[PDB]
RNA sequence: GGGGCUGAUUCUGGAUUCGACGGGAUUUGCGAAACCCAAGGUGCAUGCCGAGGGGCGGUUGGCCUCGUAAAAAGCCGCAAAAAAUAGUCGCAAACGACGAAAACUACCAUCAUCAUCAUCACAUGAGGAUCACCCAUGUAACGAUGAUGAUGCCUCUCUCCCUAGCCUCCGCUCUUAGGACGGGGAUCAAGAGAGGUCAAACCCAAAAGAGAUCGCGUGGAAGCCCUGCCUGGGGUUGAAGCGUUAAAACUUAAUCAGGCUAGUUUGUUAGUGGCGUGUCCGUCCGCAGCUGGCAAGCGAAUGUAAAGACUGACUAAGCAUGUAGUACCGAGGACGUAGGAAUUUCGGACGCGGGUUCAACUCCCGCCAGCUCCACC
């Protein structure tokens, strides 16, 4: 599959601490992403009911009406995810997606930084 | 209404490795319930009439509770957030104001210097020169303007003045000047304090210093520690007066160390009489109390308590009743077992539901959803 980095990552962005997280797409979307029909423009995530949610990121189709335009989940540790929001309580850190990448079985992960950029 | 096309890009098997994501399950823990063993307290019981307060929701099973008139939890129901590399910082500030053209002059009740700018006179120059003049610079002399200093001249208000009973001065030497008992006078630069676009001012009130050499010395009595008796060496307070300048006249207190008698207490023993927490009994009997006798201590001693059980009779508690009914409570070792902890762990993110099956898109089987193409329209 492709590996895609994010454009301003070492420009106006400095990274204090780093984690990697698995993503929930749909496996049908993963086959299209293995091919590479994607766009990463302006991607971000926000915190909703104890979890971290990817609102913006687009994957195109390869069948029937399976929606590609709805938001996708990020999975991260039961202590550490629910703790790390209390790191950003200490007067602001941005959560940045540094790269999106594929494991050796061919499913997706995202590299996440706690950043002092703007 | 139809004609068609489109649906796991790990090759059969735990693996959508993973992604402490969310159920499910064991190993392992405490609340909860039950047992094994040790172990102490408790009167127990059945039954509850009425009264005041009382309000939903967010957190608590949306009524608490109690004892002869108040013994009886409580708040809230509403906005959010920080710094320095190819670019980039939205927009944002409160400070006031003017000028006028022509002529004279002072009493010493302020006085005095110095600084500057114009001028004459005495005076030099181996300075000069347009030739009776120009110029550095020493001495005398008028003038205006500006800064700067000072004990007084003045003027006004004013602390009582003169006298003195009493009287300092002194261990001793050495060295002074006066005040406020009493009285009389309509308050003076013989003394100060203040002012004129200017400045300075300490006679007055209940006595001092020094010759270093004790920073108030020197002098004396009485009572006393034991004290129940005995050994034991040596210490002080209450009080008075002498010495030079304010002139005193009796009163009661502070440590103990060692040995012990009479005398007395305790343990022990005997005994009259006392208390004994439900009232009444008694058997187990406990405790002090006080006399007589013994054994000991005489700074390790005269400090305070009031029962523990049962065979019996009559039986209580908030209120009523059953009174031989009957049990309640509580802590600790240790064998299990629920969403606490660790872990084998399944779904994982493959359109949507069936079967075969050790698992299935790959082995079978349905239906959807979309587009494309005929067509009433």
UniProtKB/Swiss-Prot annotation:
Q: Does the keyword Ligase apply?
A: no
Which one GO biological process term can you cite for this protein? Answer: trans-translation
Superkingdom, taxonomy of origin:
Bacteria
* Main localization, broad class: cytoplasm
Q: Name one GO cellular component term.
A: cytosol
The record's keywords, sorted A to Z, are: Cytoplasm, RNA-binding, rRNA-binding
Keyword Cytoplasm in record: yes
What GO annotations for molecular function exist for this entry? rRNA binding
Q: Where in the cell is it found?
A: Cytoplasm
Q: What binding partners and quaternary form does the record give?
A: Binds tmRNA. Binds to both the 50S and 30S ribosomal subunits via rRNA contacts, bridges tmRNA binding to stalled ribosomes.
Which family, according to the similarity comment?
Answer: Belongs to the SmpB family.
The record's function comment reads: Required for rescue of stalled ribosomes mediated by trans-translation. Binds to tmRNA (also known as SsrA and 10Sa), required for stable association of tmRNA with ribosomes, probably by bridging tmRNA to 50S subunit. tmRNA and SmpB together mimic tRNA shape, replacing the anticodon stem-loop with SmpB. tmRNA is encoded by the ssrA gene; the 2 termini fold to resemble tRNA(Ala) and it encodes a 'tag peptide', a short internal open reading frame. During trans-translation Ala-aminoacylated tmRNA acts like a tRNA, entering the A-site of stalled ribosomes, displacing the stalled mRNA.
Q: What else is known?
A: Athough the Valle et al., electron microscopy paper indicates this protein came from T.thermophilus, its sequence maps to A.aeolicus. The Fu et al., paper maps the coordinates of T.thermophilus to E.coli.
Full protein name: SsrA-binding protein
Its source organism is Thermus thermophilus (strain ATCC 27634 / DSM 579 / HB8)
The organism's taxonomic lineage, starting at the top: Bacteria, Thermotogati, Deinococcota, Deinococci, Thermales
- Show which stretch of the intact protein is covered: 2 to 123 of 144
């Amino acid at each position: 599959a492709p590996v895609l980095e994010n454009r301003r990552a070492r420009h106006d962005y400095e990274i204090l601490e780093t984690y990697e997280a698995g993503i929930a797409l749909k496996g049908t979307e993963v086959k299209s992403l293995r091919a590479g029909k994607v766009d990463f423009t302006g991607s971000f995530a926000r915190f909703e009911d104890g979890e971290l949610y990817l609102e913006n990121l687009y994957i195109a189709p390869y069948y029937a009406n399976v929606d590609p335009r709805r938001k996708r989940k990020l999975l991260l540790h039961k202590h550490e995810l629910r703790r790390l929001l209390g790191k950003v309580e200490q007067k602001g850190l941005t959560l940045v997606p540094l790269k999106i990448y594929f494991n050796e079985r061919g499913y997706a992960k995202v590299l996440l930084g706690l950043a002092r950029g703007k």
